[PDB]
Design a protein around this nucleic acid. Structure first.
Lengths: 490, 359, 305, 122, 44
DNA sequence: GCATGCTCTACTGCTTCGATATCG
DNA sequence: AAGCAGTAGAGCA
DNA sequence: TGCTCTACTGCTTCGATATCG
DNA sequence: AAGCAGTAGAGCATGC
């Protein structure tokens, strides 16, 4: 779906020993888990800020829920991530936060079993929205909670399958008894370790899927086919500056007017025209005339013949290229013609040419359609989906003119030395991770303002090079290549 | 039962998570609206009239305390759709309970942002300016301020989703109709604002016609034409322009379904037919063609609202053909033989030959 | 106009380098002024904004107690203008440094995401910089060696990463530069598979009809007997017709002060249309595909009169 | 499964309930082979189409009792999400199988039984 | 820079040739020089 | 026989939300 | 709205 | 004749705003 | 563009 949100309940185990330091002096699992939950909220409040998030502890001394079980206690409820809720959550840090947790609800009681999952089910049920993904993150260390009873074991393994019957998926993020994975136990019934993904990697992202235009392609004049013109890159930028009142801090709701024809009173758009001035004469038109004088067509894709994929250089472009797809919603049977045309253009490496008009009144623009074929593997590497790419083209007053007149060749010695330089500096480019520094600094600035952890974290400029490493990786041939042919020589 | 619903409607406000109690209060307001219309006795009705308006607890002060709330709209809308029936269940005997209804209309209109609320908030005010059209209780409503506010609400940004603009264009003509002791000066600009909008909305080869803005402007022109008339003796230019606009709006389109602008244009042309003196003697043939074609439209609010226009057109053409009945021989012979051609045509319609008998 | 800066490999490669722009979008600078009717003058309009706090019956404020707040989850936060003037981002001036290289052809066609092309190409004045850069691009051209650049224009512009491709021409040697995406601007989502579908397998006679269609509708023939392909219909030298239409309507209203807009000519459409020979060639297989391929499936002026 | 018109799918559910009831009340080893078949057809619904799911489930269960014990968690999960006559259909589902359920009171207490018991419908 | 361009135009007798079946050369010449001087006025 | 009373798809339009064009 | 080189009219050899 | 300061000024570019699907 | 709420033009049914 499109308006379908997704939820997450964080289930925290505090029974007997995770509240303890587990006879260690390095890292306590309770504050580790609270760090991870706070990190997830911090990432998702700027990444995907409409989803549903909640926190539940089980095994505590107190008890409060909707049906009054024993030793089950919740802290927040299913809603958007909120600054008030993370400033309530972050009180449980350190041993001082542990003792504050002890006086708030107290650790240590007879922890029950699957009725905690029943309470998670009652949190998932009563919400009047639409839900796409239902997962339960379980923060625990004990890998055998049935040391004394088989009845609670059977009810756990039955209620978990019952929650699996209506599509709920839990996945425990496993803790560590010595520091690494060593409790090799048999949860091969309940579930369907690595927590750096819950820590780090989702500081900047957004979530969507939309279509941006639904158009028709006309082959001759009378044989047309429906396509949707999706976007793939869109140059994301920072959210707008909402206006606010200084004292009371509420929205302002400004309003605009136009008046004052040396009479006071008021004016109206029917009492005014548009104009231009050329030396002496001014030309006076209307708003509808300005709107009408840019018209050439109706919105669509007119075919204009096929072309081999050699003449269009990839040096020629003007816009982020879109991606067209066929659909059997407007006209039934367009997948057949698109698959056949795709197969023929794919085997004979020929690109199509079209005239393109986006909406109800825009002057036309020449676009070129180039096909592309899909890829996947066992890891499902869907990096290429099949379909046609719409390379834009310039017309005549986009290609500018350079001075163009300088020509001196070079001696065949430096090319091998530069080949050695670039081969010493040779590595894979990337798949990702070249994040925006100014947007990232603004993200962290907005992070450390509604929490009053004052200290504004300096943004890591990942785009910067490291010349102190690259000098030694290159080697002492800088001055050699300098004094080879281009000395400074005063 | 009695007034405990009102105090608990006040009491469903101060508690946090006002959702289920909001739904119970929604059912409470539905219960009051089901109760006070069921009354077949005027004694309990005139009791409930003053019962529903205390100054501390009640629906009006509830609206006056439901102002800073996002969810509280399906109940405030229910109260506003209820008061349109509360100023119709009785007659004119809700007269002391009227200026407060006008003030809550103005507040709930100008403070809210949802179009499902500003529409009954203007139907209520139009019904309130429609009941008390007499001389009384009309400087008790500040009609000199409604013109300034609801005229300043069309010289700003485009946000109105045109169903509100239909009601605004109707209301600025109803103001010029009833109690015209105040705006005997500013109606120069109101006709310009009625005409330029209709020119833009009907004559432009871009941007396919926002439909109900036309019906709003036509009903506002119909209500404004009285008491500030421009007939063909003092300004036979704007009257010719207005007749050209209604002539465009009565041109018969073949495939049209939602009939609102024929019912607006013909019911405007019915009343003020005498305003167009010399711009009526020329297209009489084609006028009769489109009018007689619209006489057979198998509807309930088109034929019965166009027969009035045909009737007033006949009444207005005979009184002009009679005064100089010398050169109009072909006109009178053509009209009489059209009446005979109707009366000799074998048809089984009852309201298609009672327009020939009258002619 | 020029752009002189420095291309510095590593720490000490101070090399003067000039840059010029290339293909970009195009607009006309002249905007439409607003004037009042029946006077035809400019100063009789005054536009105003009032920041009136409505929220109730309104109370108007001045433009002195007004702040800029951002949104966060469910609330609004301050720090309007001066605090962000302190805690902005810093770029220490212009930069044209080289990050790395990549031998792979994993800078593909669909991931450019820029609005221009900067064709960086030389320097002047005792051209040791020019012989150095020509040796650089003469190392880059004989392999698939791309060059990833970090570039900025001034101290306030956002920094850019991008590709610098070699360009081998006769009267000039050049290095093109395109912007690239950062990992907020990119997004990718799932689309279904069309080939291996058991509901939409086409037919080979239909495919051969498509082959006749592409043979007829083709635009390039390998003419002049040396197996170099030459096409008709070059969509890279046509002038942009929109400002030409604007020019002819402007001249029409300048010459005839009462005549309305005249509709467009036929030379514009004969410019913007495919030639007659390809339509006459393709008349029959278009009838063939229309017969063979299966069963597929207004404004305020006209609406009244 | 042809869920487009009221005349086809509700009638199909009703005649299927009659078929299942007859083949169960007769002594023949046949009722599994289509009971599990309509079970798979019903389980195909409850993720993306829930309205037609609850209508067809009520229609089958009105003449066939023991096709609720394999779905009873689903209707309790789907109870607080409906407001119209569909909530009455959910209660018509749950009425026929309270002779045999074990807890039932915590489930009714969680699903706000003392706030559906005090409404104004009939 | 500051250009000073000079145009030369023929109005000879064959410039007043009739149609061979399509259109005159005078209309083409006047329309093309119209487009050039048009753009050079409007670019200011 | 023309006048009033239930009822079924279904056309227009309100609301949010993301992209694009324009101006300062 | 805001900074970066171009180009001449006085201030100074 | 030769050098220098600076007084704007086109040529850019973020950033605020109006429209559309 | 996606979603969703609403009302109207029409269709069957009954009456002094």
């Amino acid at each position: 779906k499109y308006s379908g949100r997704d939820s997450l309940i964080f289930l925290v185990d505090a029974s007997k020993a995770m509240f303890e330091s587990q006879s260690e002096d390095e890292l306590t699992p309770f504050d580790m888990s609270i760090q991870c939950i706070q990190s997830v909220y911090i990432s998702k409040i700027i990444s995907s800020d409409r989803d549903l998030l909640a926190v539940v502890f089980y095994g505590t001394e107190k008890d409060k829920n909707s049906v009054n079980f024993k030793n089950i206690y919740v802290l927040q409820e299913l809603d958007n991530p909120g600054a008030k809720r993370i400033l309530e959550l972050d009180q449980f840090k350190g041993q001082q936060g542990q003792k504050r947790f002890q006086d708030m609800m107290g650790h240590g009681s007879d922890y029950s079993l699957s009725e905690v999952l029943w309470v998670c089910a009652n949190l998932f049920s009563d919400v009047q929205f639409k839900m796409s993904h239902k997962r339960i993150m379980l923060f625990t260390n004990e890998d055998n909670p049935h040391g004394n009873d088989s009845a609670k074991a059977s009810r756990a393994r039955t209620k978990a399958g019952d929650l699996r019957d209506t599509g709920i998926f839990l996945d425990l993020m496993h803790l560590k008894k010595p520091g690494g994975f060593d409790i090799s136990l048999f949860y091969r019934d309940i579930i369907s370790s690595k927590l750096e993904d819950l820590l780090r990697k989702v500081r900047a992202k957004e979530t969507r899927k939309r279509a941006l235009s639904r158009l028709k392609l006309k082959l001759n004049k009378d044989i047309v086919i429906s396509v949707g013109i999706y976007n793939l890159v869109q140059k994301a930028l920072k959210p707008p500056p909402i206006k606010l009142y200084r004292e009371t801090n509420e929205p302002v709701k400004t309003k605009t007017r136009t008046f004052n024809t040396s009479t006071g009173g008021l004016l109206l758009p029917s009492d005014t025209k548009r104009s231009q001035i050329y030396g002496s004469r001014q030309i006076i038109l209307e708003k509808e005339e300005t709107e009408e004088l840019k018209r050439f067509d109706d919105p669509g894709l007119m075919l204009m013949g096929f072309k081999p994929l050699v003449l269009l250089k990839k040096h020629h472009y003007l816009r982020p290229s879109l991606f067209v797809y066929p659909e059997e919603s407007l006209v039934i049977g367009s997948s057949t013609l698109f698959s056949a045309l795709l197969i023929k253009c794919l085997e004979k490496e020929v690109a199509a040419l079209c005239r393109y008009t986006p909406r109800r009144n825009i002057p036309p623009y020449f676009v070129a359609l180039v096909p592309q074929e899909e890829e996947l593997d066992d890891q499902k590497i869907q990096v290429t989906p099949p379909g046609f790419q719409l390379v834009f083209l310039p017309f005549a007053d986009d290609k500018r003119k350079m001075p163009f007149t300088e020509k001196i060749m070079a001696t065949p010695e430096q090319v091998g030395k530069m080949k050695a330089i670039v081969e010493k500096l040779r590595f894979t480019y990337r798949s990702d991770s070249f994040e925006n520094p100014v947007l990232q600094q603004h993200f962290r600035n907005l992070e450390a303002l509604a929490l009053d952890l004052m200290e504004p974290e300096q943004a890591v400029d990942l785009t910067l090079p490291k010349v102190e490493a690259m000098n030694k990786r290159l080697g002492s041939l800088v001055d050699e290549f300098k004094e080879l042919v281009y000395p400074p020589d005063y | 039962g009695v007034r405990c619903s009102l105090l608990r409607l006040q009491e469903t406000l101060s508690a946090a998570d006002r959702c289920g109690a909001a739904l119970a209060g929604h059912q409470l307001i539905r219960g009051l609206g089901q109760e006070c219309v069921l009354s077949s006795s005027p004694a309990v009705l005139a009791l409930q009239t003053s019962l529903v308006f205390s100054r501390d607890f009640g629906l009006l002060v509830f609206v006056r305390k439901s102002l800073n709330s996002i969810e509280f709209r399906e109940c405030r809308e229910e109260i506003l759709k209820f008061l349109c029936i509360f100023l119709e269940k009785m007659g004119q005997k809700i007269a002391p309970y009227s200026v407060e209804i006008k003030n809550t209309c103005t507040s709930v209109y100008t403070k809210d942002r949802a179009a499902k609320c500003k529409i009954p908030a203007l139907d209520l005010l139009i019904k309130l300016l429609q009941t008390f059209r007499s001389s009384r209780l009309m400087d008790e409503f500040k009609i000199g301020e409604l013109f300034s506010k609801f005229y300043g609400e069309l010289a700003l940004k485009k946000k109105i989703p045109d169903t509100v603009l239909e009601k605004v264009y109707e209301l600025l003509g109803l103001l010029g109709e009833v109690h015209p002791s105040e705006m005997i000066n500013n109606a120069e600009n109101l006709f310009r604002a009625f005409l330029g909008e209709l020119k833009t909305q009907m004559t432009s080869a871009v941007r396919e016609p926002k439909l109900p803005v036309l019906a709003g402007c036509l009903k506002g022109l119909s209500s404004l034409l009285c008491n500030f008339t421009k007939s063909m003796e003092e300004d036979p230019q704007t009257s010719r322009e207005i007749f050209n606009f209604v002539l465009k709006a009565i041109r018969p389109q073949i495939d049209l379904k939602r009939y609102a602008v024929p019912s607006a244009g013909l019911r405007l042309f019915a009343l003020h037919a005498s305003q167009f003196s010399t711009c009526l003697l020329d297209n009489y043939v084609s006028l009769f063609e489109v009018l007689l074609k619209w006489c057979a439209h198998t509807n309930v609010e088109l034929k019965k609202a166009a027969l009035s226009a045909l009737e007033s057109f006949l009444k207005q053409v005979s009184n002009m053909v009679a005064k100089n009945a010398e050169m109009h021989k072909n006109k009178l012979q053509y009209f009489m033989e059209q009446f005979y051609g109707i009366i000799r045509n074998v048809d089984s319609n009852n309201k298609e030959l009672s327009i020939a008998i009258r002619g | 106009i020029h752009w002189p800066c420095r291309l510095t490999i590593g720490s000490n490669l101070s090399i003067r380098i000039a840059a010029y722009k290339s293909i970009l979008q195009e607009r006309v600078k002249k905007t439409w002024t607003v004037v009042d009717a029946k006077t035809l003058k400019k100063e009789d309009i005054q536009k105003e904004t009032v920041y009136c706090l409505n929220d109730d019956d309104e109370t108007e404020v001045l433009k002195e107690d007004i702040i800029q707040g951002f949104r966060y989850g469910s609330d609004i936060v301050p720090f309007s203008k001066v605090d962000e003037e302190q805690m902005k981002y810093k770029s220490e001036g212009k930069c044209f440094s080289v990050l790395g290289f990549c031998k792979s052809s994993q800078v593909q066609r669909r991931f450019f995401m820029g609005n221009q092309v900067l064709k960086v190409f030389a320097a002047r004045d005792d051209e040791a910089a020019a012989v150095a850069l020509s040796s650089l691009i003469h190392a880059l051209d004989d392999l698939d060696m791309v060059a990833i650049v970090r570039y900025a224009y001034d101290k306030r512009a956002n920094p850019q990463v991008g590709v610098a491709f070699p360009h081998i021409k006769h009267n000039y040697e050049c290095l093109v530069y395109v912007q690239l995406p950062f990992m907020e601007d990119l997004r990718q989502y799932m689309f279904s598979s069309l080939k291996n579908s058991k509901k939409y397998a086409p037919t080979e006679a239909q495919l051969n009809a498509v082959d006749a269609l592409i043979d007829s509708m083709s635009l390039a023939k390998k003419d002049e007997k040396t197996d170099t392909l030459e096409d008709l219909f070059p969509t890279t030298k046509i002038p942009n017709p929109r400002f030409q239409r604007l020019f002819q309507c402007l001249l029409h209203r300048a010459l005839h002060p009462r005549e309305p807009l005249p509709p467009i000519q036929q030379h514009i459409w004969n410019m913007l249309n495919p030639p007659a020979e390809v339509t006459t060639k393709s008349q029959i297989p278009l009838s063939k595909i229309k017969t063979l391929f299966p069963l597929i499936e207004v404004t305020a002026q006209e609406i009244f009169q | 499964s042809f869920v487009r018109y009221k005349e086809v799918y509700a009638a199909a559910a009703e005649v299927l309930g009659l078929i299942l009831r007859y083949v169960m009340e007769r002594k023949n080893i046949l009722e599994e082979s289509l009971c599990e078949l309509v079970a798979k057809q019903l389980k195909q619904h409850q993720n993306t189409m829930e309205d037609k799911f609850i209508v067809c489930l009520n229609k089958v269960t009105k003449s066939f009792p023991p096709l609720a014990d394999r779905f009873m968690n689903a209707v309790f999960f789907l109870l607080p999400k409906f407001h119209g006559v569909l909530k009455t259909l959910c209660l018509e589902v749950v009425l026929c199988r309270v002779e045999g359920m074990t807890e039932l009171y915590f489930q009714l207490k969680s699903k706000d039984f003392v706030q559906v018991m005090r409404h104004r419908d009939d | 820079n500051k250009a000073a361009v000079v145009l030369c135009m023929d109005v000879g007798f064959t410039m007043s040739n009739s149609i061979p079946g399509i259109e005159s050369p005078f209309e083409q010449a006047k329309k093309v020089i119209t487009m050039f001087v048009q753009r050079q006025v409007f670019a200011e």
